């Protein structure tokens, strides 16, 4: 469990993924050419996890860039860290997916799938010990949604013993007026339930609300939304990238975070909530930092944690702070609001601390929660799906690709069963 | 590279074609000989070893007059001789003549030239068919062509630009017959179709461009602008530009329900005092003003099942979102219970260009609203009434029967129109 192979699929997948690479390279002290320039050797000690060592002083991301559209490849390559990626790793098609899951999963997607798998094979065989895989994609479009889930199942066949971790963006009518999004997301969720080990639920509804209500940005942009995502992706991966408390990988996380197989959808969260140009003064202490990361307003998923119960929680703190002050503040929360942490999972809230803070921020805290409240996100998609499906609206685009109504009713059923499951453990009490 | 083939049939088709290609040439800097000084335009124009840009179009007419004007015109040399096809005698406003009698004699030749244009395509997106509902060629030849394109190109996308008959702009008594006959025949072969009510264009030309007696050139130059707005997304690579196919997915919820209402703004006369400027809120408000519609109908007393905005020029997201709001508070824009609200917006970098010797004023920003409304069924209803008046007495029927048609074909076409009207009724009723 050392090396992770990253895959970014679709417009959203490549957009969000590009920013993740910009962020981590900066923290690991890597310039856009691929050379090291950093101060401390701690940035190098675990570089092998996301970066390959090329001939000389060149560190190349173990990333595979995938799309059925050329548009996205052209922009990412011109982008800030575009010259860092391996040119052979750009697996891009000509005719897109038309924000249709069926095209990405069955038609156009199935024609490009093997080309991608050939690049995943090459990268996998150059690993001393393959830890697992990480995919960035949206569930709203066609390539990220359709081809992304097709990639997951095909990888699952070849690497059954490897961990599959995804950063999955959930659609919202508040940000994107593409009507078929609830169909694409419902068809994708079904796949993720079956084939992923861990999924970070990045909700665009929550991202929009943070930018609008909290950050006070009247017209939020994808850049504003993606700034929140990169912060979360940097924070969730700290433990895999830095020597800040060793011997913890993708599998140790899954084993301790997922008590039941299907219930592997995490509610991410970050503190403090920042803006790309907001010049913030050197302040913030651990009691307020802990208080923020447990509040609904700090969640990357539009769910009220107070509406459910926590199965498991992982909290990661960054910067030069007092570890003593951290643990004391953690149980303070637990004991004060005990009705929101399952009694049948002793010591279910784990904390990690890392001396290296992110860019600009002197101290921050990322939150990873496995809460039954995530059923609110699934119910929202389910309601949007049924409204359309009840009147068989826009169905011809899917049946036209060879799909049947049976597949839709099934996707809906699994989505409803997942909701029942969350409710089942929300009501579960260890009195008998 | 995502190419699109334009087909222009009959007088109206050919004449609008001339206005469209003149305007495209201007927007991409292509000269009447096919040369350009020193991209996405390649979807509509192919290149030679001479650096000549040849439109991916075929002009067809069963009569030579209209195309002979093109063959001798300013844009002679722009089109190769082989792509301008003519017959000797027209269909004489008879659908049966254009479809069977005269039509049968030229169809294989037209298809042979389409096949030639298609071999030059590494990813043909589809066809754009331009024709009138009224003409014998516009109706019967187009129907025959659509049936054949479906055989040769299977599911391959076909969009129409159809001219809707109006008494005040040179109709003929039998035009209601040809309109219904062509509508029925083409219905299953057309994926999407934009109707252009000649009365609506006539009214804008008078009430906005201040032309008491508008010519076809005046009418066609106005249609050209609206067609250019619809096709801009395909001919230009824009950042905040949404592709016409994405609007299409939102615009057509059921295969038969494929007739979007088009609205354009601002339509300002070249002679009026230019100083006034134009705001995003002003054009969005004009996008819901019935006087700016391409088809004479009432959406205000009707339901929406998609509402899209196509911007071009100097347009910023901050302005558009403010414009999408305020107007939905004041005006009553009712959507169907199975459709979300939220307008699908696309903004192109390239501002709206005007023909130098034209009657249209140059603007910094312009908008085209494509919306799917139940209100469009009112245009079918007007046509159906005129058909019923004549058909009751079997007036003019003998001209069709004399050419090989059956009286049963008339009833079948009308039955399909009644089904379409009932289809538009059912689509507007709320669910349970």
């Amino acid at each position: 469990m050392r090396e992770i192979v990253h895959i970014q699929a679709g417009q959203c997948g490549n957009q969000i993924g590009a920013k993740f690479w910009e962020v981590i390279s900066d923290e690991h002290g890597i310039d856009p050419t691929g050379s090291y320039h950093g101060d401390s050797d701690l940035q190098l000690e675990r570089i092998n996890v996301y970066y390959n060592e090329a001939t000389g002083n060149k560190y190349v991301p173990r990333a595979i860039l995938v799309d059925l559209e050329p548009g996205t490849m052209d922009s990412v390559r011109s982008g800030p860290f575009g010259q860092i990626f391996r040119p052979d790793n750009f697996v891009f098609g000509q005719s897109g997916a038309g924000n249709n899951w069926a095209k990405g999963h069955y038609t156009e997607g199935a024609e490009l799938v093997d080309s991608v798998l050939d690049v995943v094979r090459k990268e996998s065989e150059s690993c001393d010990c393959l830890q697992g895989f990480q995919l960035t994609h949206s569930l709203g479009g066609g390539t990220g949604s359709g081809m992304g889930t097709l990639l997951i199942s095909k990888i699952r066949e070849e690497y059954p013993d490897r961990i599959m971790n995804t950063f999955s963006v959930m659609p919202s009518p508040k940000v994107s007026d593409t009507v078929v999004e609830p169909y694409n997301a419902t068809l994708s969720v079904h796949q993720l339930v079956e084939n992923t080990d861990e999924t970070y639920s990045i909700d665009n509804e929550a991202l929009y609300d943070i930018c609008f209500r909290t950050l006070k940005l009247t017209t939020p942009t994808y850049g504003d939304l993606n700034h929140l995502v990169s912060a979360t992706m940097s924070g969730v991966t700290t433990c895999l990238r830095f020597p800040g408390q060793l011997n913890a990988d993708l599998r140790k996380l899954a084993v301790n975070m997922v008590p039941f197989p299907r219930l592997h959808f995490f509610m991410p969260g970050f503190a403090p909530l920042t803006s790309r140009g907001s010049q913030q003064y050197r302040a913030l202490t651990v009691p307020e930092l802990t208080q923020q990361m447990f509040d609904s307003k700090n969640m990357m998923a539009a769910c009220d944690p107070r509406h459910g119960r926590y199965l498991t929680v992982a909290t990661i703190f960054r910067g030069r702070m007092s570890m003593k002050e951290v643990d004391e503040q953690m149980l303070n929360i637990q004991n004060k609001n005990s009705s929101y942490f399952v009694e049948w999972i002793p010591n279910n809230v784990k904390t990690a601390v890392c001396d290296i803070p992110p860019r600009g921020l002197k101290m921050s805290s990322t939150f990873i929660g496995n809460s039954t409240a995530i059923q609110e996100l699934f119910k929202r998609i389910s309601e949007q799906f049924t409204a359309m499906f009840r009147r068989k609206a826009f169905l011809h685009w899917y049946t036209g690709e060879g799909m049947d109504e049976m597949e839709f009713t099934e996707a809906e059923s699994n989505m409803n069963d997942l909701v029942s499951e969350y409710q089942q453990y929300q009501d579960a009490t260890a009195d008998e | 590279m995502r190419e699109c083939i334009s087909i222009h049939v009959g007088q109206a088709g050919v004449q609008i074609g001339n206005a469209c290609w003149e305007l495209y040439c201007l927007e991409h800097g292509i000269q009447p000989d096919g040369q350009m000084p020193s991209d996405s335009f390649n979807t509509f124009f192919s290149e030679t070893g001479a650096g000549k840009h040849v439109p991916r179009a075929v002009f067809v007419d069963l009569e030579p007059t209209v195309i002979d004007e093109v063959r001798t015109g300013t844009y002679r040399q722009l089109f190769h001789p082989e792509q301008l096809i003519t017959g000797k005698e027209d269909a004489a406003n008879n659908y049966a003549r254009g479809h069977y009698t005269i039509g049968k004699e030229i169809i294989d030749l037209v298809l042979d030239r389409i096949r030639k244009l298609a071999d030059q395509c590494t990813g043909l997106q589809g066809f754009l068919v331009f024709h009138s509902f009224g003409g014998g060629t516009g109706s019967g030849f187009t129907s025959l062509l659509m049936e054949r394109l479906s055989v040769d190109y299977g599911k391959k996308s076909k969009l129409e630009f159809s001219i809707y008959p109006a008494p005040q702009v040179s109709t003929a008594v039998v035009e209601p017959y040809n309109s219904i006959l062509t509508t029925h025949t083409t219905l299953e072969h057309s994926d999407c179709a934009f109707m252009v009510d000649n009365e609506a264009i006539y009214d804008i030309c008078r009430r906005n461009l201040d032309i008491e007696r508008p010519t076809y050139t005046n009418l066609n130059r106005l249609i050209s602008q609206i067609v250019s707005s619809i096709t801009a997304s395909l001919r230009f690579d824009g950042a905040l530009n949404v592709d016409l196919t994405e609007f299409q997915t939102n615009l057509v919820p059921y295969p038969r329900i494929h007739f979007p209402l088009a609205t354009y703004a601002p339509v300002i006369s070249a002679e009026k005092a230019y100083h006034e400027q134009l705001s995003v809120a002003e054009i969005t408000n004009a996008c819901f003003e019935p006087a700016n519609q391409m088809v004479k109908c009432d959406p205000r007393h009707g339901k929406y099942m998609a509402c899209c905005l196509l911007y071009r020029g100097d347009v910023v997201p901050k302005d558009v979102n403010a414009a999408i709001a305020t107007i939905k508070t004041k005006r009553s824009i009712q959507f169907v219970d199975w459709c979300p609200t939220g307008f699908k917006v696309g903004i192109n970098y390239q501002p709206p260009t005007v023909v130098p010797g034209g009657d249209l004023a140059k603007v910094q920003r312009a908008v085209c609203m494509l919306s799917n409304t139940t209100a469009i069924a009112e245009a079918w209803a007007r046509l159906d009434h005129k058909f019923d008046l004549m058909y009751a007495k079997r007036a003019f029927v003998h001209w069709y029967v004399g050419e090989g048609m059956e009286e049963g074909e008339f009833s079948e076409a009308r039955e399909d129109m009644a089904a379409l009207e009932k289809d538009y009724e059912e689509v507007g009723v709320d669910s349970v």
């Binding site: 009518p173 994107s176 007026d177 017209t219 939020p220 994808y222 | 905040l240 997201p317 979102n321």
Partner: peptide, 4 residues
């Protein structure tokens, strides 16, 4: 909605 016009995000950007």
């Amino acid at each position: 909605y016009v995000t950007g």
